[PDB]
Paper text:
Crystal structures have so far been determined for [name] from humans as well as from Saccharomyces cerevisiae. The “upper” lobe is mostly α-helical and contains the zinc binding site as well as the catalytically important residues. In both structures, two histidine residues (His-450 and His-455 in the human enzyme) and a glutamate (Glu-508) coordinate the zinc ion.
In addition, [name] has been shown to bind to the inactive hDPP3 variant with a Kd of 3.6 μM17. In the complex structures, the N-termini of both peptides are anchored to the protein through hydrogen bonding and electrostatic interactions from the side chains of Tyr-318, Glu-316 and Asn-394. The first three amino acids form a β-strand, which interacts with the five-stranded β-core in an antiparallel fashion (through hydrogen bonds to Ala-388 to Asn-391). One exception is His-568 from the upper lobe, which is hydrogen bonded to the carbonyl oxygen of the scissile peptide bond. In the complex with [name] an additional residue (Arg-572) from the upper lobe forms a hydrogen bond with of Phe-4 of the peptide (3.3 Å). In both complexes the C-terminal residue (Met or Leu) appears to be quite flexible as indicated by weaker electron density in this region. Quite unexpectedly, the zinc ion does not directly interact with the P1 carbonyl of the peptide (the scissile peptide) but is at a distance of 3.7 Å and 3.6 Å for Met and [name], respectively. Instead, a water molecule completes the tetrahedral coordination of the metal ion. When analysing the interactions with the catalytic zinc ion, we observed that the carbonyl group of the scissile peptide bond is not directly interacting with the catalytic zinc ion (3.7 Å distance) in the complexes with Met- and [name] and a water molecule is bound to the ion.
Numbering used by the authors:
A (entry chain A): 2 to 726
B (entry chain B): 1 to 5
The structure:
Amino acid sequence: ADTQYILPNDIGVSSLDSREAFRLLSPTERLYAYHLSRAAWYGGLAVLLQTSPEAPYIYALLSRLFRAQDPDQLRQHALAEGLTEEEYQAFLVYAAGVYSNMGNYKSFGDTKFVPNLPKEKLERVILGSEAAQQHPEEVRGLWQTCGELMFSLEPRLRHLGLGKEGITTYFSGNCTMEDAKLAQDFLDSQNLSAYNTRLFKEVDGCGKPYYEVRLASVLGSEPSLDSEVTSKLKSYEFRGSPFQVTRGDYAPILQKVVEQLEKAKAYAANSHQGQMLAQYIESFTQGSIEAHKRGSRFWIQDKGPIVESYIGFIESYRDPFGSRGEFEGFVAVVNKAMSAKFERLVASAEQLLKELPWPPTFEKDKFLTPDFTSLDVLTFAGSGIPAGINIPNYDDLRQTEGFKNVSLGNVLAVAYATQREKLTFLEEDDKDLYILWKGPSFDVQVGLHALLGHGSGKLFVQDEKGAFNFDQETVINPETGEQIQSWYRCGETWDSKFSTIASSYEECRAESVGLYLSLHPQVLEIFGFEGADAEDVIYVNWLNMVRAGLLALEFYTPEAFNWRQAHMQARFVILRVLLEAGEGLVTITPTTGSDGRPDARVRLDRSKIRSVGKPALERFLRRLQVLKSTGDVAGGRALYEGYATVTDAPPESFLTLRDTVLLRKESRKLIVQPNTRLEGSDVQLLEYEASAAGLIRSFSERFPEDGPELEEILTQLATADARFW
Amino acid sequence: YGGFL
Ligand SMILES: [K+]
Ligand SMILES: [Mg+2]
Ligand SMILES: [Mg+2]
Ligand SMILES: [Zn+2]
């Protein structure tokens, strides 16, 4: 068992396998990947600022510490100061946690984690460290500032979120959901994207709140060559509230980023790569999302590159309101062999879309030749590494230019490690099938999730004039039978309208498409299973889905009635949909484990998957798309938040089950990533041990040129914003 | 859109 809000000493650590991918790269491609990786790792540091008030200080402190003394050197100091090996290991694991999450909160669960050792003992180590002897003011200053928050588990600090009972740095501490809604309405009214923005509320002597919308850029208030953004840099009045649009957020960090983007542009393989980089540079320098969208368009047109990459404020999972983006950047190498199955999935893609439970009027008008590749990651900077990505997120680009589907092969391999001892909530005979088919069924689900999942669906949009992108005269809502009553307007996006459930809603729809189309005998041939093998993959994919729905309860907060992770919430919903169908399709039974502790069992009648499960899923999937397409947020919330409701109602009694899920939960593994170094001419790949110490070393060697400078930059930016929290 | 697990 393991306590909430701490990382266990025996937490799994896996090293990313990137040697063979890197070895295939030409000298030019290596220099390209080198600078892009540097750009990504630089930008990843901003996530610390986007996580918690104390995160940038903690990184700065750990960085100083391990720069003067590596894990084996520090051990000799720490053990001489009274720490046991167990206590030192807890600190190593904590440091690795902060590094891998770019913050002292889990990227997967948004929960705080603290060092599993006495604070006073850790103080002796830090204050007596070699880093402390060399820079006593800096180290004591850092410890004084972030020491308490490093350990504090006060209830309001335990989870990320808006309001008084949660921590967020996307907003000032005094901001609530009301403030976010107001800010979003303002942003939409000015056609300004929330992706690269943060919101700060300050009051005067009269208590009247003033709002600051701050954009992320190198440039500040000073005049620049750009006019599209600088013209927005002014004061506004919106529904009685003062609004000021500023920029300069993470400026010296983004300055490092564009330096490496510029250097990468010297090694671009084609004009599409050169142009997309110049636009990203414009985006990060000026604070223009329009510039980033232009870059994304050029990126989509760069088909099948050897070195694939993307960077910026992309995903909006961590923003409590759900519109602001967290910085991420990745560099990956194309895997020709593993891209085969996904490219033939493209061949039958347009056909399979017609098998989806909604009319073609609710589907994209012009079908675009989709891009689906399997890649090997060299760098994935930010709060975490996904198994697959579907990008860009700009919906207008999605329905005019296209989008890229990416499966991260060497990331998937890390997830393909599950001992049958850890396979909880399954009877014996189901475990065997699970081990055999979890791998292939994932490729199926991920494939459909990406291409036909996120890639399907049309948004009904009315422009500035009364013209629609759909035939409002003949298009009929299949659920109501009436003509289309609601749609998206100018300035409105998926995130802007559905806000807090936008991410989870869409992941649920995507997962449903995958689960739904996994019953198709033809899709089980593109991946090539064909027989009972194909049938087995079906059952396992459905058994894994309903098991994950139970496991999802770890990421629900009863006191706040709040889901903390979009994908897990999505999988719980699907469990609820299948449970709603009744007729003995899926049952959850509270049992007792061999260790005498509370347990549970998930039973799935495989015979009733097609007769009961599919019709229930088909109906659910249809309702999801209709409400999404029509932008029916009220209906969308009523449906989704209804299934996402967690109660101790019989017979399932989920609240009771949750306590069992927490009891037997398994901590997600930490992933160590390699480094690339320049030997003047040649680029070398540096690899590290699959351990906490190894992960620490990988970051210790990650910024050889300007490590101490980044420490000071993060400290400076944090201190400037200290009043907000 | 990212895909975890
Ligand atoms: K979102
Ligand atoms: Mg808060
Ligand atoms: Mg992480
Ligand atoms: Zn997804």
